Amino acid sequence: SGYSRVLLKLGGEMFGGGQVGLDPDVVAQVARQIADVVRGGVQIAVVIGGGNFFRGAQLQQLGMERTRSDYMGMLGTVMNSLALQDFLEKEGIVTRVQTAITMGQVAEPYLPLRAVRHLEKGRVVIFGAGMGLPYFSTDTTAAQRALEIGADVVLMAKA
Amino acid sequence: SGYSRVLLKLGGEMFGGGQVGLDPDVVAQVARQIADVVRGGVQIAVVIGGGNFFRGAQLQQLGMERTRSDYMGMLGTVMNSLALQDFLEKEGIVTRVQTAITMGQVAEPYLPLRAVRHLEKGRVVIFGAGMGLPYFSTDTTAAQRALEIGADVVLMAKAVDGVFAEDPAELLTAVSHREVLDRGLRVADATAFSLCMDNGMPILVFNLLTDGNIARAVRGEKIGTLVTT
Amino acid sequence: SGYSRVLLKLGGEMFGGGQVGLDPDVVAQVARQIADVVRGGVQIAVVIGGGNFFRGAQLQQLGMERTRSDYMGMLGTVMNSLALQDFLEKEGIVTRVQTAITMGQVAEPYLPLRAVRHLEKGRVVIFGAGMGLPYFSTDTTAAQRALEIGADVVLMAKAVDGVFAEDPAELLTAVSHREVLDRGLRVADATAFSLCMDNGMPILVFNLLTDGNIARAVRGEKIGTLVTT
Amino acid sequence: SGYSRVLLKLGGEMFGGGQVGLDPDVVAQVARQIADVVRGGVQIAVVIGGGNFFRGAQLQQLGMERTRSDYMGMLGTVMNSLALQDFLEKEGIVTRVQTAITMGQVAEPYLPLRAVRHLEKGRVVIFGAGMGLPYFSTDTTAAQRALEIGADVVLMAKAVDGVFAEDPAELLTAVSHREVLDRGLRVADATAFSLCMDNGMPILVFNLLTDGNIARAVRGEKIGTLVTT
Amino acid sequence: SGYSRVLLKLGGEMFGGGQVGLDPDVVAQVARQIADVVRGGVQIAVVIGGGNFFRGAQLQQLGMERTRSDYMGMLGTVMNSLALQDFLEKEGIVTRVQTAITMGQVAEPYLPLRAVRHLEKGRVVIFGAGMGLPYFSTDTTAAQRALEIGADVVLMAKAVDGVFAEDPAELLTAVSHREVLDRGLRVADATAFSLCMDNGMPILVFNLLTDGNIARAVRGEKIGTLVTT
Amino acid sequence: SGYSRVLLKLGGEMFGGGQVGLDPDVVAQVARQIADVVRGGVQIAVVIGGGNFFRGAQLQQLGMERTRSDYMGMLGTVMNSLALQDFLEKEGIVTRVQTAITMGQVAEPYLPLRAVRHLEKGRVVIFGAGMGLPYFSTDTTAAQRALEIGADVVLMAKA
Numbered sequence A, F: 001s002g003y004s005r006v007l008l009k010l011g012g013e014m015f016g017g018g019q020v021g022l023d024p025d026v027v028a029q030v031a032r033q034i035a036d037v038v039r040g041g042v043q044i045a046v047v048i049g050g051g052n053f054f055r056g057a058q059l060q061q062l063g064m065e066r067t068r069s070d071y072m073g074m075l076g077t078v079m080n081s082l083a084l085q086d087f088l089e090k091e092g093i094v095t096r097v098q099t100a101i102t103m104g105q106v107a108e109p110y111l112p113l114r115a116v117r118h119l120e121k122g123r124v125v126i127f128g129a130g131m132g133l134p135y136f137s138t139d140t141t142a143a144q145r146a147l148e149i150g151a152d153v154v155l156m157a158k159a
Numbered sequence B, C, D, E: 001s002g003y004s005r006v007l008l009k010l011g012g013e014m015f016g017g018g019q020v021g022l023d024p025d026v027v028a029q030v031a032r033q034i035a036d037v038v039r040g041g042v043q044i045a046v047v048i049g050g051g052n053f054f055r056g057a058q059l060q061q062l063g064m065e066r067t068r069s070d071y072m073g074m075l076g077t078v079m080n081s082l083a084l085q086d087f088l089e090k091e092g093i094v095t096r097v098q099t100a101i102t103m104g105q106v107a108e109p110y111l112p113l114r115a116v117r118h119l120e121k122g123r124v125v126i127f128g129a130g131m132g133l134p135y136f137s138t139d140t141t142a143a144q145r146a147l148e149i150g151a152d153v154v155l156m157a158k159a160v161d162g163v164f165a166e167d168p169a170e171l172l173t174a175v176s177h178r179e180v181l182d183r184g185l186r187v188a189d190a191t192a193f194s195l196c197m198d199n200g201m202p203i204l205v206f207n208l209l210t211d212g213n214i215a216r217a218v219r220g221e222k223i224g225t226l227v228t229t
């Protein structure tokens, strides 16, 4: 019955609604759901994707380098992470965004010990930038994060 | 007559085609123009915008916080910078991308002296992430970067052939910063234009889409609008 | 009532006493004032200026390059920041120094989220190196830092009792940004004032040297000049 | 005959003229001397001091913490390094500035192999921030840098004509490290002199202000004091 | 009576057992001693040596260049630091390793303020790569690090119970720096001892192998040799 | 007949002679051989190991972390690279040492374009620090370097 540590897999559709970009309504309602579950006394780590901006397969079909395409996708994931952080902060929630790409001015570097400390402090963890390396999927990143931070359950958003 | 160091300011429309996202054809033609002007033998620093992804004021009035909105806009600027770098390097042009927000795995940090050296080595110096500070714009980013790298001119690449007396109109040719302020034209943002006028930096608003326009402007042909002093 | 988050702005006079170098007495006075304000329970970010060492415009007038002059001025700001950190640690106040120019061994890189967390934890957050870019100034640095951290007010520390109608003879009390622009008053430079007006950050110009003035201003007493929206 | 690789050592007097701050005339004289030496075909690494701004020992005597005082002094050395770089670029000499404290935007991190390569390529290699560690001094910095890059001589630039037997009255010509230690002469501080003696690096103390003295010393003429093995 | 901040200098013998390489048992017992003294409630910075791998003077007299010899020695120091960190963390002790030679993937860079914060957080601050500069030793590295982090004492961990009047002899108890210089004892290298004496840093030479010796020295029990002033 | 770009795989035995440490005689004679082949008009990239100092299997058997053990091994490889660079410089050869671990004060970061430029300039390339990541072998690093820098032949030293 229930869980204590949940990793929520959010995709670009959860931030775009099908259209390319950012739709404040969908992100606001998913932030409301996360607020409900976190006030229900659960620890939440949300791993965020960037399909609403870019995908490596589509950029390779357009004819760009795989490494550059994956870095652009990770940047899109970080943008979605910032948007979700803002919408969660609008509901009185303390959130910590960790990016696998070291961008200190934007967020904090990925550290599983810091992440589990934040989870134990009640803060909502937001894993962006994927795994920080090319040739990876956000589902693989979600599995790795769940295995590392000891998340007892993984739940994927659906449309 | 002629500019050796140009700072090409490319707004988000130059990557999105007026829409939201990335347009491969517009980026390809911009890359072709940049490659032509590089093979002409010019030192070019390209300041990227992110209006095709996000704007801080727009997101703030939508409801989001200005700081995170600005950081999302700067990340979109970095994405556009990466796209332009890929398209330029698809044509044999050596490009170095520098971001004012330190992201080592993505691009080298902002080193102005190394950027000047890259320019002297015949490389296109792409400037992303703006100035790395919220409550600012890519226009003042372009002004500051052009002033620091000692650029000869700031080439504002727009979809129109130049600035007009009133939005649809007469297309002006050569104006001054004081005249622009008096007439209330639209060359750049308030802070950007204030800095550019205080430091006496020549601006050249021109239509980049017309083939060879950037080459003519660099060679010194009287096209577009020249805001000088 | 009163301001919970203040961004103090200290100029080179607050570290040089009107001369070139460093006067320990003035820095000790500033440290005592900031210490009692912190003991009052206020979140405070200070922004340091380096006019007591170098001004980029003056060095450019002398003949040096503007970019190098600006970097020398920013290094002077970092030096004054370290001096203030020392004098504040003498008073048992925990301080965190952040420099816009990344120098990890000397201080930590500018991280606004870390700065606001340090403000929450009762630490004085000192800002050196300005904004890290040439052609700007510490007034623009103060405005941008206050906007980004979310500071309630910007406290301009001066040696005089606020903004006057005519520099030497009337002492103003409360005005607006538009009123200051119309009357041609001097609060900050053009870029900083434009940014502050566009974002509506309240400014309080007051004499820090007089004992208790900063505490009174934080509590909300009517002292100096209050430039509001 | 003569020295091919020299490590010039400039103190705060060479940038302040005996006062606090920066005197452009003395820096211009130093730049002219270094420029003509480089035009002579010599590899030169300069090491900058910051006594014209701050001394850690004096600040500790005043009451500040020694570590922070030393970091302020190193930042002052970096500022003087930037001033010298500007004045050398005014003379058309290519310079590379390396700071022991990593500040990538201002200069490049201290890389000895890069420094010797820059020396090979005809660039003056300027060293700021000392050795990057507190409690040391620019004399120790000069000794260590000369040992590491492989400089043939260490040229101590002073305002007097070399080392004297008694500070104000005899002017020495050539001595050894042991002779200097026995007679109690002043060339460098204890740590730098100990390191130099243990490694046998030749020292030449001479007046840089007099025109052509550094060129004569590089060619091999007998001027100033030569402390050899 | 008692030291709160200790800088434990561990020579290469403490990792090699007198041989060349790494001895797991000696490192394990050193880690046990450090863990005991940490659980005693002390702030400890451990400066590592690399004599069990290489010495610059030895390689120079063998024929290799001094600079590369010193860099190999510093890399061996970093390897010993990593081994000590692993053995300490095998016992539940939180250790932070800092190297004066920037190697991000191996260890965090040398940040003295962050190291002091780690000490205040009850973490063992390991110092590797010496001071990152050739023509220096881990003894002067230890002296400089202890002076900068404001350590209470420098604990020289040797295989003997203290310094003697002559190598095999009377074991001294409490001496001064001047007395050590006059008697020609062996506490540290020339430069290291000069710096330590000039800055008045207390040294404590003791046998680390004897269980509880470090704990007794920290608590203030009169063991080993205390070089004070 | 002959080659133009040769990748020489050197192991810790080539620097120790069986004993733990550094033996100047073996490294001096291998430097003499490299001098002969480079004056014969060949481009040489030498990938160096660190078995003379440490091995991941031995350190794991002793009971240390795999990541730390591999970093110590890479540091040993860098030390061997510095020794070989010194002994090659003793014979009037320009050598460039590239380490996969970014240690700017010691050497230059690994860049295949810079490496091939140095090879075309006649300088001898010295690949140390392996591939910069744990769980890799120096033979795997040699294969990767040969495939990247376009080395036409790979030759492994033998005892």
Ligand SMILES: O=c1ccn([C@@H]2O[C@H](COP(=O)(O)OP(=O)(O)OP(=O)(O)O)[C@@H](O)[C@H]2O)c(=O)[nH]1
Residues within 6 Å of the ligand: B111, B113, B114, B115, B117, B118, D095, D096, D097, D103, D104, D105, D106, D107, D108, D109
């Ligand atoms: O971190 C850094 C690196 C480099 N720089 C600055 O970059 C400029 C050159 O950056 P380079 O690395 O191009 O030096 P270089 O000109 O010597 O290049 P080569 O001759 O080897 O082709 C130099 O002026 C240096 O100070 C920095 O300011 N910071």
Ligand SMILES: O=c1ccn([C@@H]2O[C@H](COP(=O)(O)OP(=O)(O)OP(=O)(O)O)[C@@H](O)[C@H]2O)c(=O)[nH]1
Residues within 6 Å of the ligand: A095, A096, A097, A103, A104, A105, A106, A107, A108, A109, C111, C112, C113, C114, C115, C117, C118
């Ligand atoms: O490099 C960094 C580190 C941290 N941060 C951001 O700074 C803010 C505070 O980072 P702190 O580490 O100062 O506070 P913390 O609450 O995150 O940890 P505790 O104090 O509870 O131990 C956090 O929101 C973090 O994401 C960065 O932006 N960059």
Ligand SMILES: O=c1ccn([C@@H]2O[C@H](COP(=O)(O)OP(=O)(O)OP(=O)(O)O)[C@@H](O)[C@H]2O)c(=O)[nH]1
Residues within 6 Å of the ligand: D111, D112, D113, D114, D115, D117, D118, F095, F096, F097, F103, F104, F105, F106, F107, F108, F109
């Ligand atoms: O980060 C670095 C880069 C370079 N170096 C070392 O600096 C020395 C010179 O590095 P340079 O790049 O200045 O000279 P180069 O000869 O290596 O390249 P060209 O000038 O031929 O273009 C080389 O020996 C390199 O290994 C470092 O130690 N660290």
Ligand SMILES: O=c1ccn([C@@H]2O[C@H](COP(=O)(O)OP(=O)(O)OP(=O)(O)O)[C@@H](O)[C@H]2O)c(=O)[nH]1
Residues within 6 Å of the ligand: C095, C096, C097, C103, C104, C105, C106, C107, C108, C109, E111, E113, E114, E115, E117, E118
């Ligand atoms: O790059 C850096 C990072 C940190 N520092 C210096 O490290 C010291 C503390 O380093 P911390 O990162 O521990 O700051 P903190 O004390 O706020 O840690 P928490 O409260 O979040 O646990 C601060 O004094 C900072 O200036 C640097 O000097 N440079």
Ligand SMILES: O=c1ccn([C@@H]2O[C@H](COP(=O)(O)OP(=O)(O)O)[C@@H](O)[C@H]2O)c(=O)[nH]1
Residues within 6 Å of the ligand: A010, A011, A012, A013, A048, A049, A050, A051, A052, A054, A055, A056, A057, A069, A070, A071, A072, A073, A074, A129, A130, A131, A132, A133, A134, A135, A136, A137, A138, A139, A141
């Ligand atoms: O560790 C990671 C995380 C993300 N990505 C790239 O990020 C882009 C967008 O992420 P995804 O396609 O996984 O987003 P979703 O489909 O979950 O919205 C893709 O090109 C991925 O290759 C990557 O390469 N490595």
Ligand SMILES: O=c1ccn([C@@H]2O[C@H](COP(=O)(O)OP(=O)(O)O)[C@@H](O)[C@H]2O)c(=O)[nH]1
Residues within 6 Å of the ligand: B010, B011, B012, B013, B048, B049, B050, B051, B052, B054, B055, B056, B057, B069, B070, B071, B072, B073, B074, B077, B129, B130, B131, B132, B133, B134, B135, B136, B137, B138, B139, B141
């Ligand atoms: O230095 C900078 C550059 C960009 N931005 C943010 O990124 C967005 C995109 O920049 P701009 O709007 O200047 O791009 P354009 O529409 O000219 O392409 C801006 O709205 C800001 O919110 C910023 O905050 N600081």
Ligand SMILES: O=c1ccn([C@@H]2O[C@H](COP(=O)(O)OP(=O)(O)O)[C@@H](O)[C@H]2O)c(=O)[nH]1
Residues within 6 Å of the ligand: C010, C011, C012, C013, C049, C050, C051, C052, C054, C055, C056, C057, C069, C070, C071, C073, C074, C077, C129, C130, C131, C132, C133, C134, C135, C136, C137, C138, C139, C141
């Ligand atoms: O972002 C910044 C902030 C400051 N400065 C330099 O800082 C020096 C002194 O700062 P200011 O003139 O703002 O100091 P004040 O007059 O307030 O003492 C000037 O040379 C500026 O160029 C700079 O270059 N960039």
Ligand SMILES: O=c1ccn([C@@H]2O[C@H](COP(=O)(O)OP(=O)(O)O)[C@@H](O)[C@H]2O)c(=O)[nH]1
Residues within 6 Å of the ligand: D010, D011, D012, D013, D049, D050, D051, D052, D054, D055, D056, D057, D069, D070, D071, D073, D074, D077, D129, D130, D131, D132, D133, D134, D135, D136, D137, D138, D139, D141
């Ligand atoms: O490695 C170094 C070199 C210099 N300095 C500081 O630099 C300042 C001025 O340097 P010096 O006293 O060597 O200058 P000079 O007397 O030669 O002008 C002093 O406060 C030193 O502490 C330092 O801390 N570490």
Ligand SMILES: O=c1ccn([C@@H]2O[C@H](COP(=O)(O)OP(=O)(O)O)[C@@H](O)[C@H]2O)c(=O)[nH]1
Residues within 6 Å of the ligand: E010, E011, E012, E013, E048, E049, E050, E051, E052, E054, E055, E056, E057, E069, E070, E071, E072, E073, E074, E077, E129, E130, E131, E132, E133, E134, E135, E136, E137, E138, E139, E141
């Ligand atoms: O700051 C430092 C520390 C170490 N080393 C080199 O590393 C070797 C090992 O250090 P030491 O000889 O001081 O170690 P111990 O024998 O005391 O363990 C020295 O010989 C030097 O060549 C160096 O050059 N500078």
Ligand SMILES: O=c1ccn([C@@H]2O[C@H](COP(=O)(O)OP(=O)(O)O)[C@@H](O)[C@H]2O)c(=O)[nH]1
Residues within 6 Å of the ligand: F010, F011, F012, F013, F048, F049, F050, F051, F052, F054, F055, F056, F057, F069, F070, F071, F072, F073, F074, F129, F130, F131, F132, F133, F134, F135, F136, F137, F138, F139, F141
């Ligand atoms: O890319 C690399 C290169 C080396 N190593 C480690 O380096 C150590 C010594 O290297 P090796 O054992 O490959 O040396 P050799 O047997 O060639 O002398 C081993 O523990 C390897 O795991 C590693 O982990 N990754």
